[PDB]
Amino acid sequence: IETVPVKLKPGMDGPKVKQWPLTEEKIKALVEICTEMEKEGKISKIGPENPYNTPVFAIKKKDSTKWRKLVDFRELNKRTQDFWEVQLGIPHPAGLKKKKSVTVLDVGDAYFSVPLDEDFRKYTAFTIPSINNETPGIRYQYNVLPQGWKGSPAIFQSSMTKILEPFRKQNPDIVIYQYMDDLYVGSDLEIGQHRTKIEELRQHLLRWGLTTLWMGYELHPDKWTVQPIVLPEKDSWTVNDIQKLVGKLNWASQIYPGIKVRQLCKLLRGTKALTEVIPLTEEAELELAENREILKEPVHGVYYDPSKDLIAEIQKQGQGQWTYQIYQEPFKNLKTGKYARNDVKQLTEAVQKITTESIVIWGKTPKFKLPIQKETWETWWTEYWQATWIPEWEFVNTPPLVKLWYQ
Amino acid sequence: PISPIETVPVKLKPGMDGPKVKQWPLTEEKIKALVEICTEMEKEGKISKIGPENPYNTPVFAIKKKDSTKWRKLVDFRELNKRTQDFWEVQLGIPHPAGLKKKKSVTVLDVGDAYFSVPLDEDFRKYTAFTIPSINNETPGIRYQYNVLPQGWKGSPAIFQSSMTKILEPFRKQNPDIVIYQYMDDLYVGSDLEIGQHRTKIEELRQHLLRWGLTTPDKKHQKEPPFLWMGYELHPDKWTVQPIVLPEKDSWTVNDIQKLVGKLNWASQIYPGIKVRQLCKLLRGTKALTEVIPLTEEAELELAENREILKEPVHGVYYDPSKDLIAEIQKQGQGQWTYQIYQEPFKNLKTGKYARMRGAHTNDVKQLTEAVQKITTESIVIWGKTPKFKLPIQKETWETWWTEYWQATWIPEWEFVNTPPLVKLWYQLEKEPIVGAETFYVDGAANRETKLGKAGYVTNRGRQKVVTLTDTTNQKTELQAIYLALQDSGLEVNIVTDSQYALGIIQAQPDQSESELVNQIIEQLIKKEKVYLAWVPAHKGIGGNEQVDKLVSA
Ligand SMILES: [C][C]N1C2=C([C]=C([C][C]OC3=[C][C]=N([O])C4=[C][C]=[C][C]=C34)[C]=N2)C(=O)N([C])C2=C1N=[C][C]=[C]2
Ligand SMILES: OC[C@H]1O[C@@](CO)(O[C@H]2O[C@H](CO)[C@@H](O)[C@H](O)[C@H]2O)[C@@H](O)[C@@H]1O
Incomplete structure (x- = not known):
């Protein structure tokens, strides 16, 4: 019981994010939850004189039927970074x-037991919308440390x-x-x-x-062996297969120092048919073996830069399998992995699992590049989301090649 | 009356002080009208006379809106508005x-x-002070401040x-x-x-x-x-958009067409099948608002289809929370889609349309998915729940598409409904190289300085051609090279390229595009029986890719 002064530190203004439409069952759940918190004094109804806003959602707790409020404080967190980080x-x-x-x-x-600095409360404003915009919308702000804000x-x-x-x-x-x-x-x-x-x-x-599901209650880190880039092991090799191999090795040569592919380029001389079988010379079967050894080891030369943002890329592999990489410098993998079981549900699960490992390893969440349409994700992510945090995300188009390399 | 409700504390933006705009001298009659209006307001409590200690001021003006007899007070709150705190959206x-x-x-x-019936935060009133100037501004004006929410002020x-x-x-x-x-x-x-x-x-x-x-x-x-509201006509058992009249004109101007499109878009909320694509095309480009735009034959056809839909009045019904929500979508043609939402078979709650993204390579399955997504979002806003869909696409077609595509796609509960045209993929690429088919190694280079370019290929059967392109880009040449391979190949063909860009577009099975090049390539892909496309690292001297990169670079 003794508030701690909080300051955005001159320069940045509070968050003014728009509230997302929610289904009737989530709105009702938020209304029940917020009416209780108000009686208990944790939050207070506010007026139009507060120009700030932060989105709010309703997810399902570790239970099964217990609704929980989730406030998206991603903006406020970024704008008060000097306070919680420095x-x-x-x-x-x-x-x-x-x-x-x-x-x-x-x-x-x-x-909820610690009061929040009275002069900072206005920045925690949020809005519970109504169906079809039939009523103005219930506005509140926090009187105690709120969940979701890194300042808490x-x-x-x-x-x-x-x-x-x-x-x-x-x-x-x-x-x-x-x-x-x-x-x-x-x-x-x-x-x-x-x-x-x-x-x-x-x-x-x-x-x-x-x-x-994605299991975020009992982890086994010292068992998080990286998902290597794997080189096929065939009986016979077609031109096509060698080209695939050169492509994959060529991509790995930008990440792993020591990767050699000259012996294989030799096998592909001339203008041959894709289906033609090409005998593997022992000089190249050696190169193959040597590359397998470099690939199953950590990337030499790549280290975590505490001052840089973590990036996570995810590719849909099919059949409920997903691959992912975490890096700071494009393609300089700090970690690679995979996740296997609908599409949106699987993605949200992979994202929660990747964020958790990231928090364990570096103590921070990565910014995700998601292979999905913005609106589809926005409409459905909360139907399966179960974590109490929310990472930064971007929506992108996966380069067909990258999916092939990490298969 | 002035409501007894507690006031909302208001403040100016930090670091700023109240406005201090000089009052412009006014004519005698305007001064008289103002004094009369302010005295009436003063007696009802709306405004209060203030002393000369208040340093703030905002311009005042009087206007006789028409050749009428009533004067209206007009306060210029532009300056106060710029200094007032921001508010939450209404x-x-x-x-x-x-x-x-x-x-x-x-x-x-x-x-x-x-x-005027709502009180203004006492600590803020001083900032609304205005002044009625005396004649020729010879003597001190009459000072007032508002006690209620002013007309024109940002917080009202x-x-x-x-x-x-x-x-x-x-x-x-x-x-x-x-x-x-x-x-x-x-x-x-x-x-x-x-x-x-x-x-x-x-x-x-x-x-x-x-x-x-x-x-x-x-x-x-x-x-x-009925009640007229937000452009709607609301009746006790149904609703519709306010009467829409389609202009009958000989010559159409940019201004007339914009108004037409606007009315059609508004009507499309309850009138099924409204189209605007051909009309919007006419508005493409830069043209004078008063310029006459001759109607293309397609626009004439589309305008006639619409007049027909708008001849017999249609209405929508209200929502019954105990029933369910159904949404049906129909392909109307060139990137145009239309949908209806209802609870009881064919009693529309509302209708709508969706147009394919411009300047983007796409196919019918992607557009449908986008339309479903647009309708899903709107449904949640309007009824707080997602409807059940009835789509013109087979379950197998959809399953083939989503399990293969690299992007995560999901559609809420839906059933197939046979209402042609149906959504389908017009061709599919092989998953493995084809035996007994010629392998084309294609490539395209383009001197960035001269803009000149070359596109060609080399095959495992010794064939090889090289054409020359003008004012092209590296990207366009990679595309042309693929097009030449398809044009000179048989019903089956393996194509090896080093253009990730080209691979990308083609793997998505595009069926529509605005790029003539991509459209030509699509025409050829549909004619084929089997096409396998592979990618090889650019300049790695890889067999085939190297033997063709020569004849193309030089
Ligand atoms: C009260 C909220 N209100 C509303 C209306 C109509 C119906 C649907 C039922 O409409 C009826 C029913 C019976 N009547 O006798 C009616 C008479 C006039 C208009 C609608 C009527 C239900 N609610 C309505 O008119 N308006 C302008 C409206 C509303 N709520 C939000 C926006 C607009
Ligand atoms: O889904 C992205 C979308 O969400 C908004 C708020 O609705 O922004 C949130 O997500 C961004 C990406 O992670 C954050 O950068 C931002 O701070 C956070 O509020 C929209 O602004 C954005 O388009």
């Missing part, structure tokens, strides 16, 4: 990604430390990391022992008022 | 008639002198609307079954009560409104059905 930044432990098991626990409830964990940081203090000293080798409204807990314990430590942690949290 | 969107639930009765009530629409919302709240809670829509200074009230208890509940509303400073017409001056 002034009260929360350290990311490099040890987290090395643990055998990492469990994710929702702790967003805690924030930043301000609640000192309280979180006190709460986890005894648990940490009792379990020195367990790594606990807070990112937005979630807590990431990693250990090398046997699964049964790990689960028991988590239950104990929930009990610690319960004393402070915290009732804490 | 409405996020406008209600569509198709989304209105059926009621036994609907009544309209307009609020008299809406803005918003503050008035939120005031009306707070005032209605109590009455809504006590009558959760009554429907009240706020539109500027109008109120539309509907209920499922018998004409008797309805007129009663209304009187009770007026009474409630009056207790808050808002006067309304009595049961004697309340307008009668």
